[PDB]
Design a protein around this motif. Sequence first.
Motif, PDB file in Angstrom:
ATOM      1  N   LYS A 159     -44.109 105.253 -75.861  1.00  0.00           N
ATOM      2  CA  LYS A 159     -45.383 104.201 -75.753  1.00  0.00           C
ATOM      3  C   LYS A 159     -46.635 104.348 -75.903  1.00  0.00           C
ATOM      4  O   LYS A 159     -47.182 105.437 -75.178  1.00  0.00           O
ATOM      5  N   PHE A 160     -47.043 104.243 -77.345  1.00  0.00           N
ATOM      6  CA  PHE A 160     -48.014 104.560 -78.300  1.00  0.00           C
ATOM      7  C   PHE A 160     -49.025 103.599 -78.555  1.00  0.00           C
ATOM      8  O   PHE A 160     -48.000 102.806 -79.557  1.00  0.00           O
ATOM      9  N   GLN A 161     -49.806 103.370 -79.167  1.00  0.00           N
ATOM     10  CA  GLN A 161     -50.316 102.236 -79.507  1.00  0.00           C
ATOM     11  C   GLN A 161     -52.492 103.319 -80.836  1.00  0.00           C
ATOM     12  O   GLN A 161     -51.900 103.657 -80.373  1.00  0.00           O
ATOM     13  N   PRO A 162     -52.224 102.267 -81.631  1.00  0.00           N
ATOM     14  CA  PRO A 162     -53.391 102.586 -82.417  1.00  0.00           C
ATOM     15  C   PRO A 162     -54.439 103.462 -81.817  1.00  0.00           C
ATOM     16  O   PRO A 162     -55.897 102.513 -82.567  1.00  0.00           O
ATOM     17  N   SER A 163     -54.413 104.096 -81.410  1.00  0.00           N
ATOM     18  CA  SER A 163     -55.237 105.267 -80.445  1.00  0.00           C
ATOM     19  C   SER A 163     -56.573 104.560 -79.389  1.00  0.00           C
ATOM     20  O   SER A 163     -57.752 104.793 -80.589  1.00  0.00           O
ATOM     21  N   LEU A 164     -55.434 103.374 -79.074  1.00  0.00           N
ATOM     22  CA  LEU A 164     -56.794 102.698 -78.255  1.00  0.00           C
ATOM     23  C   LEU A 164     -56.602 102.466 -76.664  1.00  0.00           C
ATOM     24  O   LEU A 164     -56.395 102.395 -75.941  1.00  0.00           O
ATOM     25  N   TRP A 165     -57.118 103.665 -76.638  1.00  0.00           N
ATOM     26  CA  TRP A 165     -57.132 104.651 -74.714  1.00  0.00           C
ATOM     27  C   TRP A 165     -57.907 103.575 -74.525  1.00  0.00           C
ATOM     28  O   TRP A 165     -57.765 103.251 -73.136  1.00  0.00           O
ATOM     29  N   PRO A 166     -59.888 103.430 -73.999  1.00  0.00           N
ATOM     30  CA  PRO A 166     -60.068 102.458 -73.757  1.00  0.00           C
ATOM     31  C   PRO A 166     -59.645 101.242 -74.091  1.00  0.00           C
ATOM     32  O   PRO A 166     -59.505 101.003 -75.453  1.00  0.00           O
ATOM     33  N   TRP A 167     -59.619  99.637 -73.695  1.00  0.00           N
ATOM     34  CA  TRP A 167     -59.401  98.219 -74.352  1.00  0.00           C
ATOM     35  C   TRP A 167     -58.047  98.227 -73.959  1.00  0.00           C
ATOM     36  O   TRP A 167     -57.545  97.833 -75.504  1.00  0.00           O
ATOM     37  N   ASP A 168     -57.213  98.505 -73.224  1.00  0.00           N
ATOM     38  CA  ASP A 168     -56.060  98.700 -73.456  1.00  0.00           C
ATOM     39  C   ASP A 168     -55.262  97.306 -72.986  1.00  0.00           C
ATOM     40  O   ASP A 168     -54.417  96.203 -73.215  1.00  0.00           O
ATOM     41  N   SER A 169     -55.963  96.634 -71.178  1.00  0.00           N
ATOM     42  CA  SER A 169     -55.707  96.257 -70.494  1.00  0.00           C
ATOM     43  C   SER A 169     -56.217  94.814 -70.848  1.00  0.00           C
ATOM     44  O   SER A 169     -55.512  93.733 -71.072  1.00  0.00           O
ATOM     45  N   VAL A 170     -57.230  94.900 -71.738  1.00  0.00           N
ATOM     46  CA  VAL A 170     -57.723  93.276 -72.807  1.00  0.00           C
ATOM     47  C   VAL A 170     -56.865  93.144 -73.467  1.00  0.00           C
ATOM     48  O   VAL A 170     -56.761  91.772 -73.508  1.00  0.00           O
ATOM     49  N   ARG A 171     -56.202  94.100 -73.626  1.00  0.00           N
ATOM     50  CA  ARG A 171     -55.311  93.676 -75.022  1.00  0.00           C
ATOM     51  C   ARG A 171     -53.712  93.364 -74.633  1.00  0.00           C
ATOM     52  O   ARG A 171     -53.220  92.221 -75.081  1.00  0.00           O
ATOM     53  N   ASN A 172     -53.609  93.967 -73.624  1.00  0.00           N
ATOM     54  CA  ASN A 172     -52.226  93.372 -72.768  1.00  0.00           C
ATOM     55  C   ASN A 172     -52.026  91.559 -72.599  1.00  0.00           C
ATOM     56  O   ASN A 172     -51.506  91.330 -72.624  1.00  0.00           O
ATOM     57  N   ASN A 173     -53.974  91.449 -71.852  1.00  0.00           N
ATOM     58  CA  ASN A 173     -53.758  89.905 -71.300  1.00  0.00           C
ATOM     59  C   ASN A 173     -53.858  89.369 -72.849  1.00  0.00           C
ATOM     60  O   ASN A 173     -53.155  88.065 -72.831  1.00  0.00           O
ATOM     61  N   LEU A 174     -54.309  89.484 -74.217  1.00  0.00           N
ATOM     62  CA  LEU A 174     -54.580  89.139 -74.992  1.00  0.00           C
ATOM     63  C   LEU A 174     -53.347  88.981 -75.946  1.00  0.00           C
ATOM     64  O   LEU A 174     -52.890  87.641 -76.325  1.00  0.00           O
ATOM     65  N   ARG A 175     -53.026  89.942 -75.434  1.00  0.00           N
ATOM     66  CA  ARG A 175     -51.308  89.146 -76.546  1.00  0.00           C
ATOM     67  C   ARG A 175     -49.991  89.131 -75.533  1.00  0.00           C
ATOM     68  O   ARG A 175     -49.212  88.483 -76.011  1.00  0.00           O
ATOM     69  N   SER A 176     -50.898  88.856 -74.659  1.00  0.00           N
ATOM     70  CA  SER A 176     -49.570  87.778 -73.381  1.00  0.00           C
ATOM     71  C   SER A 176     -50.217  86.532 -73.920  1.00  0.00           C
ATOM     72  O   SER A 176     -49.011  85.377 -73.956  1.00  0.00           O
ATOM     73  N   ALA A 177     -51.364  86.398 -73.710  1.00  0.00           N
ATOM     74  CA  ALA A 177     -51.907  85.036 -74.490  1.00  0.00           C
ATOM     75  C   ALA A 177     -51.378  84.479 -75.314  1.00  0.00           C
ATOM     76  O   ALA A 177     -51.253  83.304 -76.114  1.00  0.00           O
ATOM     77  N   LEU A 178     -51.018  84.774 -76.568  1.00  0.00           N
ATOM     78  CA  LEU A 178     -50.645  85.024 -77.889  1.00  0.00           C
ATOM     79  C   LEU A 178     -48.903  84.917 -77.983  1.00  0.00           C
ATOM     80  O   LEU A 178     -48.683  83.563 -78.746  1.00  0.00           O
ATOM     81  N   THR A 179     -48.772  85.589 -76.942  1.00  0.00           N
ATOM     82  CA  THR A 179     -46.801  84.911 -76.894  1.00  0.00           C
ATOM     83  C   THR A 179     -47.159  83.688 -76.508  1.00  0.00           C
ATOM     84  O   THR A 179     -46.363  83.536 -76.887  1.00  0.00           O
ATOM     85  N   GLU A 180     -47.385  83.536 -75.563  1.00  0.00           N
ATOM     86  CA  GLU A 180     -47.221  81.450 -74.802  1.00  0.00           C
ATOM     87  C   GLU A 180     -47.692  81.213 -75.912  1.00  0.00           C
ATOM     88  O   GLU A 180     -47.642  79.955 -75.945  1.00  0.00           O
ATOM     89  N   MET A 181     -49.114  81.464 -76.760  1.00  0.00           N
ATOM     90  CA  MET A 181     -49.722  80.431 -77.695  1.00  0.00           C
ATOM     91  C   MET A 181     -48.521  80.075 -78.938  1.00  0.00           C
ATOM     92  O   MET A 181     -48.347  78.986 -79.640  1.00  0.00           O
ATOM     93  N   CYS A 182     -48.631  81.335 -79.180  1.00  0.00           N
ATOM     94  CA  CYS A 182     -46.806  81.302 -80.111  1.00  0.00           C
ATOM     95  C   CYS A 182     -45.475  80.111 -79.732  1.00  0.00           C
ATOM     96  O   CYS A 182     -45.232  79.851 -80.394  1.00  0.00           O
ATOM     97  N   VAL A 183     -45.623  80.478 -78.526  1.00  0.00           N
ATOM     98  CA  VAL A 183     -44.165  79.774 -77.283  1.00  0.00           C
ATOM     99  C   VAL A 183     -44.824  78.447 -77.240  1.00  0.00           C
ATOM    100  O   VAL A 183     -43.567  77.918 -77.722  1.00  0.00           O
ATOM    101  N   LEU A 184     -45.635  77.828 -77.237  1.00  0.00           N
ATOM    102  CA  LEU A 184     -46.318  76.737 -78.415  1.00  0.00           C
ATOM    103  C   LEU A 184     -46.314  75.526 -79.383  1.00  0.00           C
ATOM    104  O   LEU A 184     -45.835  74.419 -79.296  1.00  0.00           O
ATOM    105  N   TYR A 185     -46.224  77.374 -80.494  1.00  0.00           N
ATOM    106  CA  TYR A 185     -46.345  76.822 -81.591  1.00  0.00           C
ATOM    107  C   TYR A 185     -45.367  76.241 -81.685  1.00  0.00           C
ATOM    108  O   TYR A 185     -45.013  75.472 -82.901  1.00  0.00           O
ATOM    109  N   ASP A 186     -44.034  77.548 -81.446  1.00  0.00           N
ATOM    110  CA  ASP A 186     -42.606  77.352 -81.546  1.00  0.00           C
ATOM    111  C   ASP A 186     -42.122  75.719 -80.929  1.00  0.00           C
ATOM    112  O   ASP A 186     -41.597  75.291 -81.803  1.00  0.00           O
ATOM    113  N   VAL A 187     -43.031  75.411 -79.992  1.00  0.00           N
ATOM    114  CA  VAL A 187     -41.457  74.063 -79.519  1.00  0.00           C
ATOM    115  C   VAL A 187     -42.796  73.175 -79.500  1.00  0.00           C
ATOM    116  O   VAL A 187     -41.360  71.863 -79.961  1.00  0.00           O
ATOM    117  N   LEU A 188     -43.689  73.064 -80.102  1.00  0.00           N
ATOM    118  CA  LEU A 188     -44.296  71.670 -80.415  1.00  0.00           C
ATOM    119  C   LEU A 188     -43.548  71.986 -82.414  1.00  0.00           C
ATOM    120  O   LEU A 188     -43.541  70.622 -82.442  1.00  0.00           O
TER     121      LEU A 188
END
Lengths: 130, 136, 112
Positions: free
Chosen positions: B1-30
């Motif tokens: 488990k490692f990311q492009p050197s972002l050790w602060p601002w990781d949890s904001v990216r977790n929330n935003l990418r979870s939003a990105l997953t469910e938004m891709c779910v919306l685009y997918d389903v529609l």
Amino acid sequence: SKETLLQSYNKRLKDDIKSIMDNFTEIIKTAKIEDETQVSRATQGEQDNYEMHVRAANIVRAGESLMKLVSDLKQFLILNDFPSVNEAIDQRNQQLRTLQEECDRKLITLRDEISIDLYELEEEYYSSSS
Amino acid sequence: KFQPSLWPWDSVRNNLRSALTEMCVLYDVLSIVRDKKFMTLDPVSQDALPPKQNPQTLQLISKKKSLAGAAQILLKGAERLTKSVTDFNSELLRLRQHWKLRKVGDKILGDLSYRSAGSLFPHHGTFEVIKNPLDV
Amino acid sequence: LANERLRALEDIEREIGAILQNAGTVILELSKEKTNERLLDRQAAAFTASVQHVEAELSAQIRYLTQVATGQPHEGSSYSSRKDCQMALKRVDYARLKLSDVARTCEQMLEN
């Protein structure tokens, strides 16, 4: 240019005041309760909460920008408001002239007193018998 | 488990990418709804009974909580401004009261030579002003 | 000099007052019961008066700065008077050192 900088300051001020007013008015408008239709209470409420928080953050940011504008205006005034530079220069000049004149009066009176003492000492030393 | 050197601002990216997953779910389903194949639509008239008066009470408590959070962030920023104002430009006042200064670009320079006082000495006394409260 | 700068300081404090009046107004609106609706109107008028006179002061000062800007670096100075004052003070210091030496030789003469 100076005109361009002043215009830019005017633009920033207009934009900041407009943003504070718009954000406050929009928060007040969302604060209205309306009857729901195809908005699903829970989703509508979270969206409204996010909007209010973001707008409050925007108002605080606009206040910080107004502080930045005040600081820039202060810098411009301290650097190139010609009248106050002239009064500062003149006050500095007059104060330094008074200090110079006090020093020279002290030195001249010192010279006269030392000269009288030197006259007495010269008479005593040259007229010494030895 | 490692990311492009972002050790602060990781949890904001977790929330935003979870939003990105469910938004891709919306685009997918529609999108798969939008083609007739693999997913279809049927118009159904169905009705629901609200067990409690939900818009009045839910809008009430949610709007009072939203206005509470908004007033919290606003007044927190306000008291930050109070403690924030209670020093650079005062030292620029004193420095300009003794010395000769100007601004070029973003830089603030000053003259150190007697060329204002009459010397034709081929050397400019440009000293910089550096915020560090102030230094030269 | 203190005049326009104190105006800028007052506008700093009134920007703080504008933000606090925004916050106090939504504080009163968030209350379960907000009986002092007249005080809500007073805080609203206070907020709008604050924003309006902040705009007034800053617009007036940008206008005044437009009237007295030149884009030229102000070739005046006060260097020569400081130079002459420094020379006068060093004359006084030289005389002080010499008087100390004469007083020391006088003490050596009277000391025996």
